[PDB]
């Protein structure tokens, strides 16, 4: 007979949004970069950011339609940019490639155009892992009222396994 409680009732850390944390440390392809958040550009409710992930498939299947399991993907690349009008309008804060442990079947360069950039000494990126860092980032941006613009995001969120609301 005890009730459930949420973390929206709680007080959550947010500073991982306002800094980087990556064990690649090469940080090359220093473009108009994944520029770090500060609390002047702290996230809000109702606000908008844009987002685009590139995927790779990692599964072998069978014929499955003829009158070893059916193929599914995993994430390869993520770029989340400030969609709000400002000095960092469209400037990324996430351009992170995947610290992927096991073997990856498809590079999907026709769908993703990876180098493959998922090398640890040959990063040329903030080769960063989801395990509690950027999944927490996207999860908190979901949590705070930062809507996610972009293209075809539905099955993208599915393959992420995030369930972004309406």
């Amino acid at each position: 007979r005890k009730p459930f409680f949420s973390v929206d009732t709680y007080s959550i850390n947010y500073d991982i949004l306002f800094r980087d944390y990556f064990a690649n440390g090469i940080r090359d392809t220093a473009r108009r970069e994944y520029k770090l958040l500060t609390h002047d550009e702290a996230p809000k409710s109702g606000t908008l950011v844009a987002i685009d992930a590139e995927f790779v498939s990692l599964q072998s299947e069978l014929c499955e339609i003829d009158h070893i399991r059916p193929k599914r993907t995993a994430l390869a690349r993520i770029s989340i940019i400030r969609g709000e009008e400002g000095e960092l309008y469209g400037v990324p804060f996430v351009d992170d490639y995947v610290v992927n442990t096991n073997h990856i079947e498809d590079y999907l360069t026709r769908y993703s155009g990876i180098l493959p950039g998922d090398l640890d000494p040959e990063k040329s990126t903030k080769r960063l892992v989801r395990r509690n860092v950027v999944y927490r980032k996207v999860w908190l941006l979901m949590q705070l009222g930062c809507v996610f613009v972009g293209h075809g995001l539905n099955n993208d969120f599915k393959h992420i396994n995030i369930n972004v609301p309406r």
Binding site: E61, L62, C63, D66, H67, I68
Partner: protein, 57 residues
């Protein structure tokens, strides 16, 4: 056309024509392959096997 072949040989009925059982294009050898099955008969030979290729003649 796969169903059409299923018609053309599932109705093919004889004795020396060994009966078409079924076909399937798998991906199990690594590649794709349209594997068909028939009935195993023990000790399959030709007449040239039965005399000339294999002992005896």
């Amino acid at each position: 056309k796969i169903s059409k072949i299923y018609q053309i040989w599932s109705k093919i009925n004889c004795t020396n024509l060994i009966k078409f059982r079924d076909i399937f294009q798998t991906t199990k050898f690594g590649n794709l392959s349209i594997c068909l099955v028939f009935d195993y008969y023990p000790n399959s030979l030709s007449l040239y096997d039965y005399h000339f290729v294999n002992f005896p003649k």
